[PDB]
Amino acid sequence: GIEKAQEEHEKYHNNWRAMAEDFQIPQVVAKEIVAQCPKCSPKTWQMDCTHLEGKVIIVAVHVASGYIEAEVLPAETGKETAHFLLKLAARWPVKHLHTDNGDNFTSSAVQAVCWWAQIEHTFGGVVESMNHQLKTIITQIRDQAEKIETAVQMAVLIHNFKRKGGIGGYSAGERIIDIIASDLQTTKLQNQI
Amino acid sequence: SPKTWQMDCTHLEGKVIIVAVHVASGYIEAEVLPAETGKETAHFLLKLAARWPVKHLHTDNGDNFTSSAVQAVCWWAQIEHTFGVVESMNHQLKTIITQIRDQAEKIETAVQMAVLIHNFKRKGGIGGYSAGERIIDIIASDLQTTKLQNQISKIQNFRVYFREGRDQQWKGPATLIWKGEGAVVIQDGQDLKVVPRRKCKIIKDYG
Amino acid sequence: FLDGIEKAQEEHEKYHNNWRAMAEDFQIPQVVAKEIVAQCPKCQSPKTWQMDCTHLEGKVIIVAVHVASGYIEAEVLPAETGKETAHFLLKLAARWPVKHLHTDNGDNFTSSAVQAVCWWAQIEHTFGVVESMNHQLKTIITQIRDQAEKIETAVQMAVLIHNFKRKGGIGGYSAGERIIDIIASDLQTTKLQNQISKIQNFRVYFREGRDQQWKGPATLIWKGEGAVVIQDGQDLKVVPRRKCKIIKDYGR
Amino acid sequence: GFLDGIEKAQEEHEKYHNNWRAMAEDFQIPQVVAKEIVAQCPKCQVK
Ligand SMILES: [Zn+2]
Ligand SMILES: [Zn+2]
Ligand SMILES: [Zn+2]
Structure with missing residues (x-):
């Protein structure tokens, strides 16, 4: 999932909310993925x-x-x-x-x-x-x-x-x-897991 | 309440x-x-x-x-x-x-x-x-709860034109029950059956 | 059926809904709901x-x-x-x-x-x-x-x-x-409008209960299997099929 | 085709006000278009 999100952001430069919804990743990793892009x-x-x-x-x-x-x-x-x-x-x-x-x-x-x-x-x-x-x-x-x-x-x-x-x-x-x-x-399950 | x-x-x-x-x-x-x-x-x-x-x-x-x-x-x-x-x-x-x-x-x-x-x-x-x-x-x-009870009939209000084995004519509009990833469950003449995904066309058919 | 039509008429008089919401909630066919919407003077x-x-x-x-x-x-x-x-x-x-x-x-x-x-x-x-x-x-x-x-x-x-x-x-x-x-x-919308015109090209002679006379020509709205919905006197009503005669209307 | 027949039936009903079966048997158009020609007249009535 993380490699799919990195390839998707390298291809089309999606926002972190759509990547977190479509690839089922917690939001801090998607925030760091968007923050580590030079063009964004x-x-x-x-x-x-x-x-x-x-x-x-x-x-x-x-x-x-x-x-x-x-x-x-x-x-x-x-x-x-x-x-x-x-x-x-x-x-x-x-x-x-x-x-x-x-x-x-x-x-x-x-x-x-x-x-x-x-x-x-x-x-x-x-x-x-x-x-x-x-x-x-x-x-x-x-x-x-x-x-x-x-x-x-x-x-x-x-x-x-x-x-x-x-x-x-x-x-x-x-x-x-x-x-x-x-x-x-979503916030409850993310705080639990 | x-x-x-x-x-x-x-x-x-x-x-x-x-x-x-x-x-x-x-x-x-x-x-x-x-x-x-x-x-x-x-x-x-x-x-x-x-x-x-x-x-x-x-x-x-x-x-x-x-x-x-x-x-x-x-x-x-x-x-x-x-x-x-x-x-x-x-x-x-x-x-x-x-x-x-x-x-x-x-x-x-x-x-x-x-x-x-x-x-x-x-x-x-x-x-x-x-x-x-x-x-x-x-x-x-x-x-x-209430929207589940309505959405069952709302998803059963569709029409499916399917194709069977070794017959080159599309059959009649059977009723859709559930659309899976690689299989479609239809009801035709009070008979439930399963057809593959590459043999069905799902229309709402306004008319 | 008739209770659903009267509830839809009172609901559209109060809140001025659309025809899709009334046809989904009150369980009436869409041609009757579009008729109720089209008969409103404030929704046009x-x-x-x-x-x-x-x-x-x-x-x-x-x-x-x-x-x-x-x-x-x-x-x-x-x-x-x-x-x-x-x-x-x-x-x-x-x-x-x-x-x-x-x-x-x-x-x-x-x-x-x-x-x-x-x-x-x-x-x-x-x-x-x-x-x-x-x-x-x-x-x-x-x-x-x-x-x-x-x-x-x-x-x-x-x-x-x-x-x-x-x-x-x-x-x-x-x-x-x-x-x-x-x-x-x-x-x-276009398909339903074509069906509406093709159904509305008719005419219905209806006969009331406890009377052996045929009444005035009411316009057909929806022809069912046991019930018939007609418009007469700027009012919608449901008459059974045994008290109706559906004839073609040449009234262009 | 009978499209010129439909035009001539419109002219003939505009002059002489024929009925539908007469125009359908003379100009050899189908009966639905002849009944519609009689139906569109404000003075005539299909009977
Ligand atoms: Zn980026
Ligand atoms: Zn209104
Ligand atoms: Zn005439």
Whole structure:
């Protein structure tokens, strides 16, 4: 397996995650294989903010499964963004946060919450598709509720558990639960063996 | 039961906190309410129903738990609502709140940090798991059972055109059972047989 | 059966699902589910390609990218005249189903040869992703340049590494699996639409219970072995076969 | 072939409004295309 991984990286220069999945090697050997080349994540969340009918809607998307979590913000300050990030860290395990070079995400309160929750905060074609799909669902079920908050939460529910599309035919919640369960069993068997 | 949630409310520092607990694994989601009306209670129940699969809810005979807005949200999300652990979780949450009070300025920061500490930083139990690992494992096992029972027929909904010994005509569309590495098991006219891999064509045959 | 149809109608009224999810969950045939979807007033591309020309080490490379999945087919031209561009477009239209081409306002893209190729292959040509794919392809070309003697070998090996080795996206699939799944879904949609029209060219006279009279002409949806699904009064219902007369309808 | 027969049947039904069996026996087209020619007329009705 190790010779197959070395020949595959010498031929096509694969990343360490695909080699660890396809050749069944622990991740430290694949990391050293990629690090020894001269030519050369289930817990990553991307954040964004948008506007809709004068309100500010903050959207956090889990990337490897397509999971959504949205909220209505009364303002675009830093304390409310830090509170939403604290609630997101208190609900799901967050290890790597991806954002844009903004003003509210670059704040002392949000950096204090990131330090207390031990999250790697990084600044930099999936999130635009997620926001566009959320906008189409919001325009679909707008007339079933009065305020925009109930419409946002019902759009989150429909996007999470009522859209069984894609190649596998799986919704977002079942995908993120199966991914984190398989990653937990993989880390357990690697810590045991 | 893997899909039963219970709810309760309490007071702290002049505020009103509402705590919802997944019972089978001890998973706490808590929020700070600015009022005790039915609108924000149904809004919190809608956020809980949008984040996690809630199929059965158990509450008490309160004033905000008996509301037409809560009935409308439960009808829209197809929730079986019953009237009647959470006190022990409230005691644990208040002790953690008093433990790390000195790092939070407001009250909601201390509440959400206590929720994070109780969810991911208190490893106990029998196997030595936290609460998030327990709820993820329970829901994954139940979904694996139901999806297995559907995927058997989903893989049996295919068609196989096979070839037999010393006959140059492709036979009819027998039903696939299992596709091995070098052998294919098919069912043809209530007769199970095994053909090699180089003598079969597997189509879904839209038409 | 009828309980499943009424549950699917209430579910589509609430949440506005698609027809595949309802046909898999509620155990109804796909023609009835597509009928329920098509009767919604609030519920109403896999064959588009982009072309580009670039320069690399004194040669002229031409890249054609399938947009909906990111599928790159590249070639090396001897010159930048119109005839070799028309020949590459004819090869691309011969291997993959192309129905809409998106190009820029170049000179060799505006020629009688490209116009005759688009006329013979029936392709809608539109003059205005690709820069990002060109950046990724040129980084891969500069990554594995030393393993090839000429430039065309490095170009084809970079196309292979980009198509079948680099994995990403939501589920972690490559580009070839995405284009094959998208085209297969389009094929399933076209076959089901042909079956829907061929069944919907009929008419049904139905007779209600405790009445010896025939009612109005309801449109047939799905003809089963014991049950018959009809549409009447903007409503779907299931009538048994012993109370129905299926006749041909000439109503163009 | 009877493709010119189909064109002449369209012209003849546009003028005189024949029925389907008459055109199928005169112009020697099959009965399905003659019934479709009668079916496409908004004033006629196949009977
Ligand atoms: Zn390398
Ligand atoms: Zn609809
Ligand atoms: Zn006529």
